Amino acid sequence: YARPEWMIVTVLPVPPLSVRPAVVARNQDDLTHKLADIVKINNQ
Amino acid sequence: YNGFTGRKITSQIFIGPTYYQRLKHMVDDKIHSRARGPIQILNRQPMEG
RNA sequence: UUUGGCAUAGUUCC
């Protein structure tokens, strides 16, 4: 159930749109902003 | 004297003009009830307020 | 018959 090497994150789960809902003018959550920054750095 | 029966009250009462105040806290601004109303978005629990 | 959030301040009751 917990292999030691799995604790090194190489695949990052993305929570669904229910965990980070949009805001009604559409606003993005703190999680969404951090996800966007992370994927920006990752593709760079 | 008693109001309903008209008979004297045995104990004499202490009565006089005192200066009273009506505070801001009324009941029409505090009564509240709920039965299956609006519901929050993130948790899908009832709203607050 | 449709739903904003974060922060700060004040007040009520033990």
Curated annotation (Swiss-Prot), chain A:
It is found in: Nucleus; Cytoplasm; Chromosome. The tandem heptapeptide repeats in the C-terminal domain (CTD) can be highly phosphorylated. The phosphorylation activates Pol II. Phosphorylation occurs mainly at residues 'Ser-2' and 'Ser-5' of the heptapeptide repeat and is mediated, at least, by CDK7 and CDK9. POLR2A associated with DNA is specifically phosphorylated at 'Ser-5' of the CTD by CDK7, promoting transcription initiation by triggering dissociation from DNA. Phosphorylated at 'Ser-2', Ser-5' and 'Ser-7' of the CTD by CDK9 (P-TEFb complex), promoting transcription elongation. Catalytic core component of RNA polymerase II (Pol II), a DNA-dependent RNA polymerase which synthesizes mRNA precursors and many functional non-coding RNAs using the four ribonucleoside triphosphates as substrates. Pol II-mediated transcription cycle proceeds through transcription initiation, transcription elongation and transcription termination stages. RNA-dependent RNA polymerase that catalyzes the extension of a non-coding RNA (ncRNA) at the 3'-end using the four ribonucleoside triphosphates as substrates. An internal ncRNA sequence near the 3'-end serves as a template in a single-round Pol II-mediated RNA polymerization reaction. May decrease the stability of ncRNAs that repress Pol II-mediated gene transcription. Belongs to the RNA polymerase beta' chain family. Component of the RNA polymerase II (Pol II) core complex consisting of 12 subunits: a ten-subunit catalytic core composed of POLR2A/RPB1, POLR2B/RPB2, POLR2C/RPB3, POLR2I/RPB9, POLR2J/RPB11, POLR2E/RPABC1, POLR2F/RPABC2, POLR2H/RPABC3, POLR2K/RPABC4 and POLR2L/RPABC5 and a mobile stalk composed of two subunits POLR2D/RPB4 and POLR2G/RPB7, protruding from the core and functioning primarily in transcription initiation. Part of Pol II(G) complex, in which Pol II core associates with an additional subunit POLR2M; unlike conventional Pol II, Pol II(G) functions as a transcriptional repressor. The C-terminal domain (CTD) serves as a platform for assembly of factors that regulate transcription initiation, elongation, termination and mRNA processing. This is DNA-directed RNA polymerase II subunit RPB1. It comes from Bos taurus. The chain holds residues 242 to 289 of 1970 of the full protein.
UniProtKB/Swiss-Prot annotation, chain B:
The modification N6-methyllysine is found at K24. It is found in: Nucleus. Transmembrane segments: none annotated. It comes from the Eukaryota. Catalytic core component of RNA polymerase II (Pol II), a DNA-dependent RNA polymerase which synthesizes mRNA precursors and many functional non-coding RNAs using the four ribonucleoside triphosphates as substrates. Pol II-mediated transcription cycle proceeds through transcription initiation, transcription elongation and transcription termination stages. Component of the RNA polymerase II (Pol II) core complex consisting of 12 subunits: a ten-subunit catalytic core composed of POLR2A/RPB1, POLR2B/RPB2, POLR2C/RPB3, POLR2I/RPB9, POLR2J/RPB11, POLR2E/RPABC1, POLR2F/RPABC2, POLR2H/RPABC3, POLR2K/RPABC4 and POLR2L/RPABC5 and a mobile stalk composed of two subunits POLR2D/RPB4 and POLR2G/RPB7, protruding from the core and functioning primarily in transcription initiation. Part of Pol II(G) complex, in which Pol II core associates with an additional subunit POLR2M; unlike conventional Pol II, Pol II(G) functions as a transcriptional repressor. Belongs to the RNA polymerase beta chain family. This is DNA-directed RNA polymerase II subunit RPB2. It comes from Bos taurus (Bovine).
